[PDB]
């Protein structure tokens, strides 16, 4: 229904996995919230202290 491990990933279908490949290829690596918070923190540190 959602995910059966990499041991089984052919069960879904060929158009299925093909669109899967193209969306992974066209979408960047998945990042978490901590990455965005750290990026904002780096930005406000790079703005310099008044």
């Amino acid at each position: 229904a959602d995910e059966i491990p990499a041991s089984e990933m052919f069960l879904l279908g060929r158009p299925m996995l093909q669109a899967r490949l193209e969306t992974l290829q066209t979408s960047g690596p998945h990042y978490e919230l901590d990455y965005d918070q750290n990026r904002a923190m780096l930005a406000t540190l790079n703005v310099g202290p008044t």
Partner: protein, 40 residues
């Protein structure tokens, strides 16, 4: 109080920046997926 309001202003600006980055990334991925799906 002045220090506190400055701190919250900075925090809010940071949150807007994070949300803008996420929204831009999502919209770029969505448009590019649109082009790809249109191709197939």
């Amino acid at each position: 109080w002045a220090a506190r309001t400055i701190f919250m202003k900075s925090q809010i600006k940071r949150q807007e920046a994070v949300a803008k980055a996420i929204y831009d990334r999502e919209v770029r991925s969505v448009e590019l997926a649109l082009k790809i799906a249109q191709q197939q």
